[PDB]
Amino acid sequence: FVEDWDLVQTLGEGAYGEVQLAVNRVTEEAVAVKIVDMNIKKEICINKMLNHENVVKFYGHRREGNIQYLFLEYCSGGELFDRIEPDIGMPEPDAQRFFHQLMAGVVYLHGIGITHRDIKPENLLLDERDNLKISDFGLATVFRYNNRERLLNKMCGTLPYVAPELLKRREFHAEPVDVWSCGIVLTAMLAGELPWDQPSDSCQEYSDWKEKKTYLNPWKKIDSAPLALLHKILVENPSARITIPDIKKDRWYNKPLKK
Ligand SMILES: NC(=O)c1nnc(N[C@H]2CCCNC2)c2cc(-c3ccc(Cl)cc3)sc12
């Protein structure tokens, strides 16, 4: 009977189907079941490569007709999105802890040559101890294989989180794109709002940032220390944008905090 599971509740809904909570009949172990009506083959292949404490673990899959089932590590704390209070954000120490964990998971992915391509609070989950787990690898791809980097060209992601080079250039490096979205997530956590609809030449809020008008929201709400880190992350030229090894040396990143 140890291979029997009960579907007890609906957790979420992807663009493909729904996420349900399954509980083992014998052990009471819980696992999230992603249901996609019925891209998916690739998501499964990438998931099989993942093994890190800040990345949702993959247990297996099953296809029963035109419906694909993905078995994943259950994150009872839900989406990071739901911890962000509109127009407020969250306490700085919590944001810093989540950011440290997000960096750990991103360093891990990049180390194995995987880029997520859709980092945002809806795709960052929390376990029962509020540990952050990167989730939703449906847009992820390989950017390094046999120690050779491949440039990306596919436009994908979520506009408010995408880096400007994706919109403007035919090809671009993968890593700086994921660094940029992490910066947008940090901004959301500290201000409870996204800075712009998209980082385009025609977006006023993006121009304001390029013009250093930090006396405006959301910047005004952010302390000088984390704001200085955002100044290094949200840099238009991806070749000049801060890399993760340098983020790890940032003053705010290393500031001891607590509520
Ligand atoms: N792997 C999981 O665990 C898992 N995976 N995906 C979820 N939602 C997707 C939806 C599409 C965007 N990306 C997130 C999700 C929602 C959860 C939850 C947990 C507790 C509660 Cl009260 C509510 C929801 S747990 C969970």
H or E stretch covering 111: helix 92-111
Using CA atoms, how far apart are residues 196 and 140, in angstroms rounded to an integer?
A: 24
Q: Do residues 52 and 105 touch, judged by C-beta distance below 8 A?
A: yes
Give the method of determination.
X-ray
Q: What are 229's two structure tokens? A: 């880190």
Using CA of residue 86, residue 57, residue 10, residue 42, what is the dihedral sign? positive
Q: Which of 37, 94, 118, 130 is catalytic?
A: 118
* CATH 3.40.1350.10 for domain 1-85: no
Instruction: Please give the resolution of this entry in Å, rounded to 1 decimal.
Output: 1.4
CATH of 86-259, one of 3.40.109.10, 1.10.3720.10, 1.10.3860.10, 1.10.510.10: 1.10.510.10
Closest CA to 117 of 181, 198, 58: 181
The type of residue at 124 is L
**118 is known as an active-site residue:** yes
Closest CA to 20 of 67, 88, 52: 67
Using CA atoms, how far apart are residues 206 and 214, in angstroms rounded to an integer?
A: 11
H or E stretch covering 190: helix 174-191
Using CA atoms, how far apart are residues 23 and 103, in angstroms rounded to an integer?
A: 31
> How far is residue 1 from each of residues 6, 15, 25, 28, 193, measured CA to CA in Å?
12, 33, 7, 12, 48
Closest CA to 191 of 218, 230, 231, 226: 218
Pocket of ligand 1 (CB under 6 A): 11-12, 14, 19, 32, 56, 72-76, 78-79, 122-123, 125, 135-136
From first CA to last CA, the distance across the chain in angstroms is 46
| Residue 15 marked as a ligand binder | yes
- The distance from CA 112 to its chain's CA centroid, rounded to whole angstroms, is 17
* Domain ranges in the chain with CATH number 3.30.200.20: 1-85
| Residue 17 marked as a ligand binder | yes
